Amino acid sequence: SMQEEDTFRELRIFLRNVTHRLAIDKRFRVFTKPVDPDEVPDYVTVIKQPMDLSSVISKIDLHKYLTVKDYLRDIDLICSNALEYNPDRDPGDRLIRHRACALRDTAYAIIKEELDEDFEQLCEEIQESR
């Protein structure tokens, strides 16, 4: 129905706003763009599903997220990709990991404070109906 379509539009608006707030945060610059194969040619071989915040915006716009849970899977993938690709004790890897955990924790905290649980539940029920 049009009211279901309005629901998903509201979801996209909400997700774009959360993703913009993450993308403008200086700590999260490394997560804003896909990794350049030049810098890092083994990236695309180690990490089987790369994900970054510009890809997340593209997916919102392509209507790939019908629930906040589905969007959070992608935030979680940005984080887990960084933990897996940079697992060493050296400062460069520890800084990326700390920033990745911070991305994840920040996205979850914004959603906890600003997503209405009944709105998520509505999205879930429409999704489940299709």
Ligand X SMILES: C=C/C=N\C(=O)[C@H](CCCNC(=N)N)NC(C)=O
Site for ligand X, rule CB under 6 A: 94, 97-98, 101
- The residue (of 97 and 111) whose beta carbon lies closer to ligand X is 97
**Beta strands in 30-114, from DSSP E residues, in sequence order:** none
Provide the minimum distance between the beta carbon of 4 and ligand X in the complex, in angstroms, as a whole number: 37
Q: Are 17 and 110 in contact (CB under 8 A)?
A: no
- The residue (of 24 and 101) whose beta carbon lies closer to ligand X is 101
Provide the minimum distance between the beta carbon of 97 and ligand X in the complex, in angstroms, as a whole number: 3
C-alpha span between 21 and 28 (Å, rounded): 10
Provide the minimum distance between the beta carbon of 79 and ligand X in the complex, in angstroms, as a whole number: 8
Query: Two tokens at 63?
Result: 């209507």
C-alpha span between 114 and 15 (Å, rounded): 11
Provide the minimum distance between the beta carbon of 72 and ligand X in the complex, in angstroms, as a whole number: 16
Task: Provide the residue type at 27 as one letter.
Answer: R
- The residue (of 27 and 59) whose beta carbon lies closer to ligand X is 27
The residue number with the shortest CB distance to ligand X is 101
